[PDB]
């Protein structure tokens, strides 16, 4: 579940992203951003899995959904 | 180098997948979950940078949700 | 509805094409040039809008090259 | 040639784009933006023309280069 993406992880990600200070509201915003992205990619990865008649999502399957 | 713990990231991914498949059982190669997380992270990081040029652009130094939302809006 | 005159836009296009082909002769369907110009215009217009949300975002009302350049930078 | 894209055309484009006022420097900026875009698309349209063994750039040829 989504609250399992922690404040510290979000700051490390932001730090790596060059962000220096952040609003308290970034935390929930960043979670919204990741839920949506994951839902898009995953739904596509799985759809292509399913299409190829497999039942095991591969690394090219994910890589397709990114494309 | 992954900044989100693999297990919290994996539960999420499974919950998301399960809320989509809703009963159809799929397996995930450990290398599928990993590749996903790389992409998940790398997206957040670029998204953070872009949103931050917006912040700077507004004279500020503190990232605001409007910085992130503008960035996404400009990406499409 | 096209805001650039078709002829100035066509000379340009030909000059550009000729500077690429550099001797190889190609013809352009009138409908190729037209489709191109639609796309050319429609790109400028969306690019103008995005750059303008940037302007607004900076408190300003006057579009600056930095607005346009940030927008492009955020598109990639 | 590029100076053949006129100040008034640039303002109509900006107006349609919702821009209210613009800097004098937009004009040359907008021209830079269009030269590059045209060079990318055209070079691709022509390359696909050439690839298909034709000598006449079509409307699906351009449409491919946009994709």
Curated annotation (Swiss-Prot), chains A, D:
Residues bearing PTM N6-lactoyllysine: 7, 53, 67
Record annotation: effect of changing residue 67 to Q: In TEBIVANED1; results in severe early developmental defects when expressed in zebrafish embryos; results in defective cell cycle progression when expressed in zebrafish embryos
Annotated effect of mutating residue 7 to R: Abolished ufmylation
Variant or mutagenesis effect after changing residue 8 to L: In TEBIVANED1
Keyword terms of this UniProt record: Acetylation, Chromosomal rearrangement, Chromosome, Citrullination, Disease variant, DNA-binding, Hydroxylation, Intellectual disability, Isopeptide bond, Methylation, Nucleosome core, Nucleus, Phosphoprotein, Ubl conjugation
Modified residue annotations for N6-(beta-hydroxybutyryl)lysine: 7, 53, 67
Cross-link (Glycyl lysine isopeptide (Lys-Gly) (interchain with G-Cter in SUMO2)): 7, 35, 55, 67
GO molecular function, one term: protein heterodimerization activity
Assembly and interaction partners: The nucleosome is a histone octamer containing two molecules each of H2A, H2B, H3 and H4 assembled in one H3-H4 heterotetramer and two H2A-H2B heterodimers. The octamer wraps approximately 147 bp of DNA. Found in a co-chaperone complex with DNJC9, MCM2 and histone H3.3-H4 dimers. Within the complex, interacts with DNJC9 (via C-terminus); the interaction is direct. Interacts with NASP; NASP is a histone chaperone that stabilizes and maintains a soluble pool of Histone H3-H4 dimers.
Name of this chain's protein: Histone H4
Record organism: Homo sapiens (Human)
Highest classification ranks of the organism: Eukaryota, Metazoa, Chordata, Craniata, Vertebrata
Curated annotation (Swiss-Prot), chains B, C:
Main location: nucleus
Keyword DNA-binding in annotation: yes
Mutagenesis or variant effect for residue 10 to E/Q: Impairs interaction with HJURP, association with chromatin and localization at centromeres
Reported modifications of this chain: Ubiquitinated. Interaction with herpes virus HSV-1 ICP0 protein, leads to its degradation by the proteasome pathway. Methylation is low before incorporation into nucleosomes and increases with cell cycle progression, with the highest levels in mitotic nucleosomes.
Modified positions (Phosphoserine) in chain numbering: 10
Keywords for this protein: ADP-ribosylation, Cell cycle, Cell division, Centromere, Chromosome, DNA-binding, Host-virus interaction, Methylation, Mitosis, Nucleosome core, Nucleus, Phosphoprotein, Ubl conjugation
Gene Ontology terms, MF aspect: chromatin binding; DNA binding; protein heterodimerization activity; structural constituent of chromatin
Biological process terms in GO annotation: CENP-A containing chromatin assembly; establishment of mitotic spindle orientation; kinetochore assembly; mitotic cytokinesis; protein localization to CENP-A containing chromatin; protein localization to chromosome, centromeric region
GO cellular component terms attached to this protein's record: CENP-A containing nucleosome; chromosome, centromeric region; condensed chromosome, centromeric region; cytosol; nucleoplasm; nucleosome; nucleus; pericentric heterochromatin
Renumbered residue ranges of the record's region CATD: 17-58
Outcome following mutation: residue 46 to G: Reduces location at centromeres. Abolishes location at centromeres
Listed result of changing residue 10 to A: No effect on interaction with HJURP. Impairs localization at centromeres
Disulfide-bonded cysteines: none
Highest taxon of source: Eukaryota
Compartments it resides in: Nucleus; Chromosome, Centromere
Function (record text): Histone H3-like nucleosomal protein that is specifically found in centromeric nucleosomes. Replaces conventional H3 in the nucleosome core of centromeric chromatin that serves as an assembly site for the inner kinetochore. The presence of CENPA subtly modifies the nucleosome structure and the way DNA is wrapped around the nucleosome and gives rise to protruding DNA ends that are less well-ordered and rigid compared to nucleosomes containing histone H3. May serve as an epigenetic mark that propagates centromere identity through replication and cell division.
Family statement: Belongs to the histone H3 family.
Additional remark text: Antibodies against CENPA are present in sera from patients with autoimmune diseases that developed autoantibodies against centrosomal proteins.
Domain comment quoted from the record: The CATD (CENPA targeting domain) region is responsible for the more compact structure of nucleosomes containing CENPA. It is necessary and sufficient to mediate the localization into centromeres.
Protein name: Histone H3-like centromeric protein A
């Amino acid at each position: 579940n989504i609250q399992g993406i922690t404040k510290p992880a979000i700051r490390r990600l932001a730090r790596r992203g060059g962000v220096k200070r952040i609003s308290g509201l970034i935390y929930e915003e960043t979670r919204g951003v990741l839920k949506v992205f994951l839902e898009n990619v995953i739904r596509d990865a799985v759809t292509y899995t399913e299409h190829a008649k497999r039942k095991t999502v591969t690394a090219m399957d994910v890589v397709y959904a990114l494309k | 180098h992954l900044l989100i713990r693999k297990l919290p990231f994996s539960r999420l991914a499974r919950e998301i997948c399960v809320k989509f498949t809703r009963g159809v059982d799929f397996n995930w190669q450990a290398q599928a979950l990993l590749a996903l997380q790389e992409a998940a992270e790398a997206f957040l990081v670029h998204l953070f940078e872009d949103a931050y040029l917006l912040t700077l652009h507004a004279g500020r130094v503190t990232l605001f949700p409007k910085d992130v939302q503008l960035a996404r809006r400009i990406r499409g």
